[PDB]
Design an enzyme around this catalytic site. Structure first.
Site, PDB file in Angstrom:
ATOM      1  N   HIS A   1       0.803  -1.222   0.000  1.00 39.70           N
ATOM      2  CA  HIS A   1       0.000   0.000   0.000  1.00 39.70           C
ATOM      3  C   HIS A   1       0.838   1.276   0.000  1.00 39.70           C
ATOM      4  O   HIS A   1       0.278   2.377  -0.119  1.00 39.70           O
ATOM      5  CB  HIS A   1      -0.934   0.008   1.213  1.00 39.70           C
ATOM      6  CG  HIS A   1      -1.954  -1.087   1.197  1.00 39.70           C
ATOM      7  ND1 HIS A   1      -2.850  -1.254   0.160  1.00 39.70           N
ATOM      8  CD2 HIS A   1      -2.243  -2.054   2.103  1.00 39.70           C
ATOM      9  CE1 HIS A   1      -3.637  -2.284   0.424  1.00 39.70           C
ATOM     10  NE2 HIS A   1      -3.296  -2.783   1.599  1.00 39.70           N
TER      11      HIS A   1
ATOM     12  N   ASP B   1      -2.961 -10.423  -2.492  1.00 41.32           N
ATOM     13  CA  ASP B   1      -3.532  -9.952  -1.235  1.00 41.32           C
ATOM     14  C   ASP B   1      -4.972  -9.501  -1.471  1.00 41.32           C
ATOM     15  O   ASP B   1      -5.336  -9.103  -2.576  1.00 41.32           O
ATOM     16  CB  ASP B   1      -2.653  -8.817  -0.685  1.00 41.32           C
ATOM     17  CG  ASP B   1      -3.179  -8.209   0.607  1.00 41.32           C
ATOM     18  OD1 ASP B   1      -4.139  -7.410   0.548  1.00 41.32           O
ATOM     19  OD2 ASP B   1      -2.604  -8.490   1.677  1.00 41.32           O
TER      20      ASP B   1
HETATM   21  N1  FKS Z   1      -8.483   0.407  11.406  1.00 39.36           N
HETATM   22  C1  FKS Z   1      -8.852   0.388   9.938  1.00 39.36           C
HETATM   23  C2  FKS Z   1      -7.983  -0.601   9.172  1.00 39.36           C
HETATM   24  C3  FKS Z   1      -8.855  -1.723   8.553  1.00 39.36           C
HETATM   25  N2  FKS Z   1      -8.028  -2.648   7.673  1.00 39.36           N
HETATM   26  C4  FKS Z   1      -8.285  -2.448   6.154  1.00 39.36           C
HETATM   27  C5  FKS Z   1      -6.992  -1.983   5.430  1.00 39.36           C
HETATM   28  C6  FKS Z   1      -5.751  -2.838   5.805  1.00 39.36           C
HETATM   29  C7  FKS Z   1      -5.197  -3.659   4.607  1.00 39.36           C
HETATM   30  C8  FKS Z   1      -3.701  -3.997   4.758  1.00 39.36           C
HETATM   31  C9  FKS Z   1      -3.191  -5.302   4.035  1.00 39.36           C
HETATM   32  O1  FKS Z   1      -3.813  -6.463   4.483  1.00 39.36           O
HETATM   33  O2  FKS Z   1      -3.262  -5.204   2.639  1.00 39.36           O
HETATM   34  C10 FKS Z   1      -1.654  -5.380   4.422  1.00 39.36           C
HETATM   35  F1  FKS Z   1      -1.004  -6.266   3.652  1.00 39.36           F
HETATM   36  F2  FKS Z   1      -1.030  -4.218   4.230  1.00 39.36           F
HETATM   37  F3  FKS Z   1      -1.418  -5.694   5.712  1.00 39.36           F
HETATM   38  K     K Z   2      -4.400  -7.592  -4.335  1.00 40.63           K
HETATM   39 ZN    ZN Z   3      -4.564  -7.128   2.648  1.00 40.90          ZN
END
Ligand code: FKS
Ligand code: K
Ligand code: ZN
Ligand code: FKS
Ligand code: K
Ligand code: K
Ligand code: K
Ligand code: MG
Ligand code: MG
Ligand code: MG
Ligand code: MG
Ligand code: ZN
Lengths: 344, 347
Positions: B164, B200
Site C-alpha cells: 500500500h 492480497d
Molecule cells: N483500522 C482500519 C484498518 C482496517 N483494515 C483495512 C486496510 C488494511 C489492509 C492492509 C493489508 O492487508 O493489505 C496489508 F497487507 F497491508 F497488511
Molecule cells: K491484491
Molecule cells: Zn490485505
C-alpha cells in the site's frame, strides 16, 4: 449603541465525546459551553435583543455546498452506526496524494472523501446543530438586509474551514460563506468576507476562489506551523476571474496586536479599494494570548479596538462566530468586539 | 519430511514495530497487524521444513530510494523523534491531511508532514518503526538476491507489509513497498522486465502508483471492490496505466462472497497477461487475507486453495520472489502462506 444576537439552543445537539489529538482520543475543544458562555456575557452586558433563528431550509445552504455533501452530512451517523462501528464517526482513510477524487460507496470511503481532518467527530445531532447554526447566520444576514447596521450570529458549530464539499476543523456548513452568498442572492453586488479567527478560513477561500464578486481575506497563524497546513499561504491570491480577490496575511508565534493590527490595516485597505456592499466578519477570539491551541498575544482590551476598527469600514456587517477556546474569556472577548463596534 | 529448496528470509527486527494503538471505527484499539503474524508463519515454515531460513543482508537505503523519494525516507527516519519533541503523548497518527481542494505542499510542522505523507490514520508510527521497515525491505532485497544468484524462488517473510505504500505515502500498515523495491532491484540488475502480481485481498495501490507510467514493470492486482473496501480511491478496473504505462496496469475486482472458482478465473486472466508480457522475473505480493476465515475478507478461499495458487504460480516458469503482505493471524495463517510455497514446490 445596541446590536442584536441570533442564538439557537439547538447547538447543544452537537455534543461529541471524542476528539483525535496527539494520537489519543480527548475531550473536544469545540464544546457547548463555548456558545453558552458568549450568550451569558451578551445578556450580562445587555448588548441587545437576543432572538432564535428562523428556518430557511437547505436552499441557501446548497447555494454554497454541494447536494451530495449535504445529503452525506444528514445520513452519515445513521450509516456509521448501521455499518457496526462502535466509536463516533471519524475518518480512517482519505484520498491520499496519488489517489483518485472518486466518491466510493462504503461509509468509510465517503467519510474520508468529504473530510480534511480526523479531529471533527460526527455523532447524533450534528446534522441538526449544523443546520441550526447555518440558520443563525442567515437570520443575522436578514436582520442586516432589513435595516440593522450589524448583527451577531452566535454560530456553533463554526464554519470557516468547511469547503463546498469538505468538513473539518470543527466546521460543517460554512456559515460566513452562506451569509455572504445570501447577500449576493438578494442583490448586493459585492461582498467581503474578513476572517480574523486565528486559523485560516480555508473553506471560505476555496468556495469563492474563482470569483471576483466575493472578496475573501484571512489573517491567521502561519500554516507552515498550524492548521490547516495545506492552504492559507500568502501566494494564494485567487484563480481565473478570482485573481486578486483572495488575500492571506500570515503571522508567526508571539505576534502582538501591534503587528497583527498592521495586517488588519492591509485588509481594511483592500476592502476599501474593493468597495463591497456588505461585510461578513468570520470572528474567532482564538487570537487571544491565553488560547490553548494558538500563538497570538491579543488582550481582551484589543477586541474592543478590533470592533471599533471594523465599524470604521462603514459597511453592513454580519459577525459569524468561529473559534476561541479559552472558556473563561471567550464570552468577554467576543462581546468586546461587538461593544467595540457599537462605540463602547 | 526432508528440507525443501524454497528458502525463507526472516528478520527478528520486525518485532521493533510493535504499536499499541490503531484507529478503527472511531476507537483506538489493539492493532490488527501484530508481530505474532510473522512469528506464526515462521513456525509453520520450520514445522513444514519448507527450506533454509536466513536473516537478511543490510543493503542500505540505496535500493529503497530507487522506489521512494528521499524526502519521504528522511521523514520516516525522524517522524517518531519529531512527534515526541512536539509534545504529543499518543503514538504518531495523522490528524489532518491534504483534503480535496487543498495544496500538495509540504509544511514544516510534524502534524502537517504526517498528513502530507499518509493516506490513512490506522497505521500508527512509534519507536522502532523506522528500523523494522528498513529490515523488511532488506528481507525482500535478500530474497531478490537469492533468486538473482540462482534460486528459482524465495520467500521474503516481510513485516511490516509494503504493497500500500506509494513512492512518498504510507498507510494500510505499510511503509516501504518491499515488492516494488525487489522489482526495481531486478530491473537495476539487468532483468529487462518485471511483473508484480498482487494476490492480497486489498488492491496494491502503492505498487500501481509507483510504476503507473512505465511499461517495463507490469503491475497486476486481484482484490475486493474498492467501492466497498480499502483503499477505496484506487484499484478500479478502468485504471490501466498512463503514458508509456498504458495497458501495463491491470486491476481485477471481486464482490462479496467470491469463491475460489471465480477468483481463479481472474488469476487465469492475470497469468495470461503475465504470459504475453513475458517478464524476466516475477514478484508476488502475497496476502493470505483472501482466506474465508480472515476477519476482513469477503472471499471464500480455503486452506487447500493456497496449494492450488502456488502450483499455478509455478506454472508461469519464472524466477519468483514472494513478499509477505496481509493476512490476520487466525490459527491457519502460517498453514495458508506456507501452502502457497509448498504448492509452488510441487506439493
Ligand atoms: N483500522 C482500519 C484498518 C482496517 N483494515 C483495512 C486496510 C488494511 C489492509 C492492509 C493489508 O492487508 O493489505 C496489508 F497487507 F497491508 F497488511
Ligand atoms: K491484491
Ligand atoms: Zn490485505
Ligand atoms: N485534535 C487536534 C485538533 C487541533 N485544532 C485544529 C484547529 C482547528 C481550528 C478551528 C477554528 O477555531 O478555526 C474553528 F472556528 F473553525 F473552530
Ligand atoms: K483567519
Ligand atoms: K474570491
Ligand atoms: K506499469
Ligand atoms: Mg469500511
Ligand atoms: Mg485563564
Ligand atoms: Mg501541529
Ligand atoms: Mg524479453
Ligand atoms: Zn480558529
Amino acid at each position: 449603541g445596541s446590536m442584536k444576537t441570533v442564538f439557537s439552543p439547538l447547538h447543544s445537539r452537537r455534543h461529541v465525546k471524542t476528539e483525535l489529538d496527539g494520537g489519543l482520543l480527548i475531550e473536544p475543544h469545540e464544546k457547548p459551553s463555548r456558545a453558552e458562555t458568549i450568550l451569558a456575557r451578551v445578556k450580562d452586558q445587555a448588548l441587545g435583543e437576543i432572538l432564535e433563528p428562523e428556518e430557511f431550509g437547505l436552499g441557501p445552504v446548497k447555494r454554497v455546498h454541494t447536494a451530495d455533501y449535504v445529503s452525506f452530512l444528514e445520513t452519515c451517523w445513521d450509516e456509521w452506526v448501521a455499518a457496526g462501528k462502535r466509536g463516533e464517526a471519524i475518518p480512517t482513510f482519505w484520498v491520499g496524494r496519488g489517489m483518485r477524487a472518486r466518491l466510493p460507496k462504503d461509509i468509510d470511503g465517503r467519510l474520508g472523501y468529504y473530510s480534511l481532518g480526523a479531529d471533527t467527530s460526527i455523532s447524533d445531532g450534528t446534522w441538526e446543530a449544523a443546520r441550526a447554526s447555518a440558520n443563525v447566520a442567515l437570520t443575522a444576514q436578514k436582520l442586516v438586509a432589513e435595516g440593522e447596521r450589524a448583527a451577531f450570529a452566535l454560530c456553533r458549530p463554526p464554519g470557516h474551514h468547511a469547503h463546498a464539499d469538505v468538513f473539518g476543523g470543527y466546521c460543517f456548513f460554512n456559515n460566513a460563506a452562506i451569509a455572504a452568498q445570501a447577500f449576493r442572492d438578494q442583490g448586493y453586488g459585492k461582498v467581503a468576507v474578513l476572517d480574523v479567527d486565528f486559523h485560516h478560513g480555508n473553506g471560505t477561500q476555496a468556495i469563492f476562489y474563482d470569483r471576483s464578486d466575493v472578496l475573501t481575506i484571512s489573517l491567521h497563524g502561519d500554516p507552515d506551523l498550524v492548521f490547516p497546513h495545506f492552504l492559507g499561504f500568502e501566494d494564494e491570491t485567487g484563480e481565473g476571474d478570482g485573481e486578486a480577490y483572495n488575500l492571506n496575511i500570515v503571522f508567526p508565534p508571539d505576534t502582538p496586536f501591534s503587528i497583527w493590527s498592521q495586517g488588519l490595516e492591509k485588509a481594511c485597505e483592500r476592502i476599501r479599494t474593493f468597495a463591497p456592499d456588505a461585510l461578513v466578519v468570520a470572528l474567532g477570539v482564538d487570537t487571544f494570548e491565553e488560547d490553548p491551541i494558538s500563538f497570538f498575544k491579543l488582550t481582551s482590551g484589543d477586541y474592543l479596538k478590533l470592533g471599533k476598527r471594523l465599524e470604521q469600514l462603514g459597511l453592513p456587517t454580519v459577525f459569524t462566530m468561529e473559534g476561541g477556546y479559552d472558556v473563561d474569556a471567550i464570552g468577554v472577548n467576543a462581546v468586546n468586539v461587538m461593544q467595540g463596534f457599537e462605540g463602547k
